[PDB]
Design a protein around this ligand. Structure first.
Ligand code: GSU
Length: 463
RNA sequence: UGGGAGGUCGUCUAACGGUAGGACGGCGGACUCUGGAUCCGCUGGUGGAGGUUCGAGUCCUCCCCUCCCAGCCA
């Protein structure tokens, strides 16, 4: 009888703040074997959409969040749109009017900012004309409390609160009413949402017992925030899952973070969502707001790029290119595997991984100013690039140890300083001053590609 | 202000009432080469006050701040 869901809202895209709350119900529904449902909350006709109401599922899907019921697929307890159900929220909203719980509020047409009176009677002689009309829920005295699964005994004073509209003039449910209705008809066992709703729960409870139903289990976990410590959205830089996927951040690496920022770890903070099911701590999560951190995220991501199998990585890297603009060249899979096995221990993102292996692939790579302005332009940099092609020319064996021999046997030949000899060969074959092990670089780049890049630099030296 | 929720290094997080520790960042070594990366190291916090105590992040009280609900937003 376990059925937890996630009620999104079509408004641009989804960020880590929302995804994290989604990841929870996902795992939970899996640890207990319950059903996970997807319910798009688009009751706000003003900010309604479809595009932004689609980019959400794709991302979640990319996050590895599979859902049982949803609008994208089938679903008996549907429809799954807080808009394609204006036939249900109707009769129910009118049933509350019976028990004197909901009264038709008649508004003034002359001014869209004036109220007339209160009445349970149906204002046919007003709505038919033009006078906007809604439906409010009368709040009676008392204390509407509940047992939060994280906050505990949450007691509230209905007195401090009052009649709140539950039906927009355009015959559209607001939210507190839309939730209660779909949180019962869809038979939801547990409701695990953010924390900004912890204040709305009371308003909802009064609706449950109103219809004579039985509210489910409510729990409100911390909220991922930004720098100013405000509820994460988009104004906090770029915390949209869509963004990360662009920058080249793995999925398993990001997931391992959301379940690390707020939700703790029973050992090594580095892991995956799989090996964390049976060891899921529904309550042992977080209790306070958690600021998002790119640095910790990128750090965690970079590591996953080293633990996972070599094959696993390349696959994801391939898919990334298709997502982003510029694509990958055409090279030997075994050669690509090597260069991809040498540059993976330097970059912490797929973007940085591509912008570093480019020289290993394409040969029309440029030369960063640093290299030229610092070492290359040095009058005593050409003579060093001379023996660089000579010694190597003779080298019958082209491996690390061997290539390692030549290099060191140069910096100590009066030719030039230690680093000077290394940075010249480096940028000569990579075009950058920051690349993988020079012993690996010169190695993986075979013997031919090397000599060419040595010549190239030479011919260019002449400004 | 009304009502809720929460405060430990810059950030995420440990501490039977009894050592404020561990990580990311940052700064520094090392890697008989580069450094985003790799091993370690290094400072850095109890939101601020009174009191109960041999002693309090931990217990009581006052003060301060932060986020949410006080929309025909969700
Ligand atoms: N800055 C933030 N940090 C961390 N969590 C955040 C968040 N902003 C929203 N959330 C949480 O993400 C989920 C979806 O957000 S949302 O698309 O706006 N939808 C809604 O708020 C409501 N339709 C949810 C209905 C319900 O569960 O009762 C909701 O659970 C919401 O509480």
């Amino acid at each position: 009888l376990v059925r937890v869901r996630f009620a999104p809202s079509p408004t641009g895209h989804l960020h880590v703040g929302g995804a994290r709350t989604a990841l929870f119900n996902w795992m939970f529904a899996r640890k207990e074997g319950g059903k996970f449902i997807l319910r798009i909350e688009d009751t706000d006709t003003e900010r309604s959409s479809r595009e932004y109401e689609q980019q959400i599922l794709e991302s979640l899907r990319w996050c590895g969040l599979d859902w049982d019921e949803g609008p994208d697929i089938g679903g008996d307890f549907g429809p799954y749109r807080q808009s394609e159900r204006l036939e249900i929220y109707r009769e129910y909203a009118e049933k509350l009017v019976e028990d004197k719980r909901a009264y038709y509020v008649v508004y003034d047409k002359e001014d869209p900012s004036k109220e007339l009176f209160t009445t349970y009677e149906y204002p046919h002689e007003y709505k038919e004309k033009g006078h906007p009309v809604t439906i409010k829920f009368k709040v009676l005295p008392g204390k509407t409390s509940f047992e939060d699964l994280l906050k505990g005994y949450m007691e509230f004073d209905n007195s401090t609160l009052e009649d709140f509209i539950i039906m927009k003039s355009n015959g559209f449910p607001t939210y507190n009413f839309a939730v209660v209705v779909d949180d019962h008809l869809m038979r939801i066992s547990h409701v695990f949402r953010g924390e900004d709703h912890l204040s709305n729960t009371p308003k909802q409870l009064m609706i449950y017992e109103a219809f004579g139903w039985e509210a489910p289990v409510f729990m409100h976990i911390p909220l991922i925030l930004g720098s100013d410590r405000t509820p994460l959205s988009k104004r906090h830089g770029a915390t949209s899952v869509e963004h990360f996927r662009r920058e080249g951040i793995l999925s398993r690496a990001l997931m391992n973070y959301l379940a690390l920022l707020g939700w703790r770890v029973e050992g090594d903070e580095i892991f995956t969502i799989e090996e964390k099911l049976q060891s899921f701590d529904p309550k042992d999560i977080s209790n306070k707001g958690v600021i998002f951190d790119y640095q910790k995220l990128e750090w965690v991501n970079g590591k996953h790029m080293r633990r996972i199998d070599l094959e696993d990585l390349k696959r994801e890297f391939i898919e990334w290119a298709k997502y982003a603009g510029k694509e990958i060249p055409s090279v030997d899979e075994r050669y690509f595997s090597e260069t991809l096995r040498i540059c993976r221990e330097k970059v912490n993102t797929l973007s940085q991984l591509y912008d570093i292996m480019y020289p290993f692939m394409n040969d029309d790579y440029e030369y960063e100013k640093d290299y030229v302005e610092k070492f290359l332009k040095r009058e005593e940099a050409e003579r060093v690039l001379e023996e660089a092609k000579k010694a190597f020319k003779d080298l019958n064996s082209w491996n690390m140890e061997e290539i390692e021999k030549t290099l060191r046997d140069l910096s100590e030949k009066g030719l030039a300083s230690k680093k000077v000899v290394f940075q010249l060969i480096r940028g000569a074959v990579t075009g950058k001053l920051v690349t993988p092990g020079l012993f690996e670089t010169i190695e993986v780049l075979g013997k031919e590609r090397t000599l060419k890049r040595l010549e190239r630099t030479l011919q260019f030296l002449k400004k």
